[PDB]
Design a protein around this ligand. Structure first.
Ligand SMILES: Nc1nc2c(ncn2[C@@H]2O[C@H](COP(=O)(O)OP(=O)(O)O)[C@@H](O)[C@H]2O)c(=O)[nH]1
Lengths: 815, 822
């Protein structure tokens, strides 16, 4: 059997001090209680009143005495029972406290003070359980507290931290949401909600949870840092979707919450650099690296920005600090190698780039820079290899693609068509990557004044300048106007001297540096360009992408590159009947326009200096020499030069090249000559010198210059003939081989043109034979060809401008 | 004839004489092929032991192989066989210099030049060694002897730059900066890549005031050496100084540009960072300015100005805990810093720590005895604490320092209404003197292009910052909801600094009725004035008086031809540009002796219209039935509770026994001012157990409901409550007011009379006290009153806007009447 009970009702409950108490009149109300107890020692309300007063005074031992006196007079008093529990909790008797709360609620279930106090102590019992690992027994103790008081927020919040610790993030959320509903001023709940929303991949909602958290506590540092982190991550997310400025805005806000968050510094350096604001980007990077000494990315990007400023010393130091943090950081190894390539430290540059490639085996630009390095040291086969390996990785790489076509000219003697096919194959693949204009508004009238355009990056002191100063000066702007599209990366006195000249005669000058080739293409239509002539070919910083769109009705290539462009968009190429004879078996994608006499016209800088005495008179021997690229001096050229120097007794050879500062290049260049018979004390490998005056006064040490093949010199022979030193050249089957033919011949020294090796050799030693004839030839040369058609501008412009107007006349009909 | 040496006649020597191995060896030597050349030289010497050029070539080759004393042994045979070979003598002098025998080097250099005066190598090396001797003598203090050694090298080689540079160095430390400049200019002309000369030139130009010249000198220096660190730091210092100079000429933008470029040269130059925070704060870009200040204080922990300006920016964010932290570190670095002392005291004032606030502000006044705004903040402290006479004393102290201080002058006039009874005319004179001063500083518009038709459609401008949950809002809601907008189109100029739900609600209603709402927060009052003229405003009505964020400066320009003041301030404005003032026949009787600057426009019924809170709550029963005692009290400003009010209330609390007082004010959050009020009241005969000082309850609904605690409210005098008595009436709590001489003393008269309860309008103290104890006797009658007051006042003219509206717009066109007539 089971026990059951019927309940009887008791006697009907009978029909200043505490009002002062509610208004915090502790001392006055206390006195009335003390008086009340001496008038009647069994009034429980007086005992409870004094106990609350004494509890304010921190006299807890006395309060437990009188609260117990109240329960012993009148048990089932919710107030007295609840207060004895409050004392039991503050003393540390938590379970005895909850017992007193429970018998209070039995007395009066409506007495919410006991419900709230009980929920608090049960929550504390549950969180003590959680730390002891009894999590499930703790979770239950939480839910009991919520049954007693469903509005106690700490129970919801403590439920959320285990539901997150047990990785039930949805459950942890709903606990935190109701914690925030029962207490809108719960920062910790809002902050922990933001952390979950962040880790789950919605930072916008994480950020609005952090916003609500810091609205309650602006100095909640943990949430402050998490706010910066979330704001930086969302800045990066918005930046990659194309909105750079809003990403920058988020980055700066992230710094408001955390002014030393390095990740926002670095990302602001990246975004400002992309905005071309490099001066400020440098500051952000230094600040990032200051706060984060492990941010090797900031050191790298600083090195890049300082290399674009030509501060190579500081660029090295930045790369060094990057590589001291991440030794296998592929960018900094490559970037350091690029700097060393420029400084001439060839061995170190190769080591740097080789390590960059080991780090990133598909670092295509690293392979292209390696080919650049090999070509600079005059190793064309290996340079082409490094370009071909880059092209295996990126078949559309603009850099290696053009650098490979250019490199192949240094060794192509043109007995097949593989060179022309390589150019043509490149032109097809390149033109498909470029939208082409299929109609042109230009008014078709043959004898209209023509505005012709020259696009080139070489309007500074550069090889092309000496041959593009003659037209700019002696062009007739009245009926052949010129519009110069200058892509000069670093201008100099020559650029402004050109510019001010061009502007004075009535032509246009547009700086196109940093401008995409597609906008340049549409500028060409704005300027109504009739003749668009590019002067770079596949040499560095060319603008062939502009040509690939065909902005002008007619396009020509000239001066810059000794071959075809391979572009079907170009129609013409300006040569002469000697550099490209009419029987040339070399294929070229453009139609060849052969100008009267020479296709070039040299203009010498008047600060060259006078023709200096022939050294053979003061030295007792004849010195041969060349000032061409190391890349042009093939091993078959050293063979021929060694025959020449084995023919002339005690003669000497001198060559000046940039890589000759590095002695690994100089020593190996010597070794190849000593196994070739020529010993070291007869050969002088001079390093590059920086002054132009000193350069053309460095022909003082040379009696005869020897041209290169299959890539013959163009400016170097023109400069040599200007300083009195004659040049024996060799003809060939391709254009790059016969430039020396046309130059020497139209100057008047065609008898110094050789058709083969043996003639080349015999001509050179024949010329070293009579030293007095040398001395007279030296003085005759400068004025011989200053009055030739090689140095006379106005003569050239007529035939060129007549070619331009025939160009125009063909187009007009529809050729 | 005892005499000195005679003149010497010189004869010429034997004629100079009229190759291949010597030429080969010399070219090998010229191209650094030294070991090969040495072989050929040695062969020349065994063929001819006296070949002097082979001796010289051998010595040069051997010297490059670090065999020095053997090279000396070749050069010495060279000088023995040929004593007039300049080349040999110079190589001996070169060796002498390399071996530290600096005197024997100049010895052989001079000997070589005696041999050949045109031998340039001898001149060049001798110039080098002589300047080295000169700098050595300068290090040894023989300054003048060093200067002549420089000029000696300049005589032999006038193209040797280091002589010019070192001359400029000594000239600089001798403070001949013009001589130093010309020396460096020549040094740069002889050597254009002489960076140190450009750097030192910039230092002179900077120290002489010409920054713009200095930065170009540093530019030419760093174009040669981009990594010249002290030239970089000097460039940042100059750029920051020049950015500050041009920022004080008004061009803040490029002043910022100079600061940023300085950071490119020195990324941790704290001075540029702090100045960027100053400029970016002036541009209102407070978030970025915080980062600049934190970076400045990070790189310069001794920059207390960064901590000060940081605290100010976080205080305007209400992050007082962080503001305090900022101010305390600024005082960690500069304990005497007046701004941070004052600012920390401002924060303490807002928090309620009245005496820490007073001590701080006093320390600021010690640091700067003319700190006008510190005196003003002292008065604000005293006014908040309720000590009006000291608040006025603080304002008057500031006005001695700055007679045109706006905060002080307007706070002084407003504070005088709390205590002024109005027997004299000194209050009106103080207002009139302020208006004369204030109009002397605001240019007036003398022409008004507004069309002159008396019954034309006209626009009424309301300009107030109180269009938010503010006392004034409860009285301006009525004209906004009930206005014609047809011939009386209203235009609001809201200067609300922190909008809330009521502001959005007001902006909605005015736009739906057909008016315009223009937020003028932060816009200059003179720009506000011409904005009043753009919007064709015909009658400008200001609602703020001398209370906070008033726009009386706009009014002082007189942008509109007719100007009014209303609601906000219980007195005249003092401005002669304001033409009229809206009041009523009870608050301002026709027989009043209180003098104004504007013409009084008395209106029918009350001059105010109360639109009450929608969610106020219901009326609560009178608590006297539950308590057993009657409760008195007031929810008015502590400032309004003058000590004279306290004495009157004291004898009220003495007449009704076992009754209590309750007063709810913000300054009672500070327990010290709390019980200072109590001890004052105890000496007045009413001890602390019968008084209750309630801190402000920041929730509106709970504040309205707090009237449950009190049976009868007691108006203040001479400044009588305006919202509070309206509020208390709407909660059924009756309020007895006392009338007086001035308008602030008779607001409660107009309110109560026109609400329907003129029997609670006292006429003196004895009236006031006995009417209160009259209603403190019949508790049942009080139960009748509490549930009736609500519906009568809603029916009173005090709460019905449309009737109020036509009365207002009648007076409005009645002023547009006189404007056209002339
Ligand atoms: N939220 C809130 N507002 C209050 C409280 N006490 C007063 N106010 C507001 O402050 C205004 C009273 O300002 P006061 O200067 O005393 O008005 P006046 O003395 O009648 O001219 C009223 O409009 C109330 O809305 C409070 O305890 N809580």
């Amino acid at each position: 059997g089971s026990r059951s009970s019927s309940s009887s009702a008791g006697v009907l409950s009978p029909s200043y001090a505490n009002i002062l108490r509610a208004r915090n009149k502790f001392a006055d109300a206390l006195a009335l209680y003390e008086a009340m107890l001496e008038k009647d020692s069994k009034n429980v309300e007086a005992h409870i009143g004094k106990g609350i007063c004494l509890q304010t005074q921190n006299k807890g031992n006395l309060a437990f005495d009188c609260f117990s006196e109240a329960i012993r007079l009148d048990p089932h008093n919710a107030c007295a029972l609840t207060h004895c529990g409050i004392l039991h909790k503050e003393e540390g008797r938590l379970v005895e406290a909850a017992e007193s709360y429970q018998k209070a609620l039995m007395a009066d279930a409506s007495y919410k003070p006991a419900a709230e106090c009980l929920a608090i102590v049960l929550t504390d019992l549950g969180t003590s359980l959680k730390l002891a690992g009894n999590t499930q027994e703790g979770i239950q103790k939480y839910y009991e507290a919520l049954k007693i008081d469903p509005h106690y927020a700490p129970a919801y919040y403590n439920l959320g931290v285990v539901y997150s610790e047990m990785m039930q993030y949805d459950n942890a959320l709903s606990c935190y949401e109701k914690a925030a509903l029962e207490r809108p001023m719960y920062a910790e709940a809002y902050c922990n909600m933001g952390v979950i929303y962040k880790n789950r991949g919605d930072l916008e909602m994480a950020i609005t949870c952090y916003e609500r958290c810091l609205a309650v506590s602006p100095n909640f540092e943990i949430a402050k840092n998490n706010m910066a982190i979330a704001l930086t991550d969302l800045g990066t997310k918005v930046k990659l979707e194309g909105d750079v400025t809003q990403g920058v805005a988020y980055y700066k806000k992230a710094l408001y919450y955390n002014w030393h968050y390095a990740d926002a510094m670095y990302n602001l350096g990246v975004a400002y650099g992309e905005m071309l604001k490099f001066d400020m980007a440098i500051v952000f990077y230094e600040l990032a690296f200051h706060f984060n000494p492990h941010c090797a990315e900031a050191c790298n990007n600083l090195g890049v920005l300082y290399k674009d400023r030509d501060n190579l010393d500081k660029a090295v130091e930045c790369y060094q600090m990057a590589l001291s943090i991440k030794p296998n950081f592929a960018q900094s190894l490559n970037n350091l190698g690029v700097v060393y390539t420029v400084q001439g430290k060839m061995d170190a540059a190769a080591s740097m780039i080789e390590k960059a490639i080991l780090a990133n085996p598909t670092y295509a630009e690293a392979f292209n820079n390696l080919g650049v390095l090999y070509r600079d040291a005059g190793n064309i086969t290996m340079a082409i290899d490094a370009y071909e390996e880059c092209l295996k990785i990126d078949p559309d790489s603009r850099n290696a693609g053009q650098n490979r076509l250019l490199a192949m000219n240094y060794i192509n003697e043109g007995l097949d068509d593989k060179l022309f096919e390589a150019h043509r194959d490149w032109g097809w693949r390149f033109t498909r990557l470029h939208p082409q204009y299929t109609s042109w508004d230009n008014l078709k009238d043959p004898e209209r004044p023509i505005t012709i355009g020259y696009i080139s990056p070489d309007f500074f002191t550069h090889s092309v300048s000496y041959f593009i100063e003659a037209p700019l000066t002696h062009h007739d702007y009245t009926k052949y106007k010129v519009v110069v599209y200058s892509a000069v990366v670093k201008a100099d006195a020559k650029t402004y001297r050109f510019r001010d000249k061009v502007l004075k005669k009535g032509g246009v000058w547009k700086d196109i540096y940093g401008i995409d080739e597609k906008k340049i293409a549409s500028m060409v239509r704005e300027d109504k360009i009739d003749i668009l002539v590019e002067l770079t070919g596949h040499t560095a910083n060319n603008k062939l992408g502009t040509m690939a769109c065909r902005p002008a009705p007619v396009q020509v290539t000239w001066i810059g590159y000794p071959n075809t462009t391979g572009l079907p968009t170009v129609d013409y190429r300006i040569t002469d009947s000697l550099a490209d004879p009419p029987d040339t078996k070399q294929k070229q994608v453009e139609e060849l326009v052969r100008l009267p006499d020479c296709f070039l016209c040299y203009t010498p800088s008047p600060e060259a200096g006078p023709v200096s005495p022939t050294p053979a008179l003061s030295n007792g021997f004849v010195t041969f020499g060349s000032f061409n690229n190391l890349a042009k001096i093939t091993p078959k050229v050293l063979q021929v030069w060694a025959r020449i120097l084995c023919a002339v007794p005690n003669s000497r050879l001198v060559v000046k090249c940039k890589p000759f500062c590095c002695d690994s290049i100089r020593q190996r260049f010597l070794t190849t000559l000593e196994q070739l018979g020529l010993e070291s004390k007869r050969v002088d490998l001079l390093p590059l010198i920086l002054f132009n005056h000193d350069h053309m006064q460095a022909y003082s040490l040379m009696d005869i210059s020897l041209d290169t093949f299959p890539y013959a010199g163009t400016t170097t022979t023109c400069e040599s003939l200007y300083m009195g030193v004659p040049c024996v050249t060799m003809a060939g089957s391709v254009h790059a081989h016969n430039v020396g033919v046309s130059l020497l011949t139209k100057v008047g020294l065609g008898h110094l043109v050789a058709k083969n090796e043996d003639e080349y050799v015999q001509l050179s030693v024949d010329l070293a034979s009579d030293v007095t004839a040398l001395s007279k030839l030296r003085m005759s040369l400068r004025d011989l060809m200053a009055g030739s058609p090689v140095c006379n501008g106005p003569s050239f412009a007529v035939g060129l401008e007549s070619a331009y107007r025939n160009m125009w006349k063909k187009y007009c009909k529809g050729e």
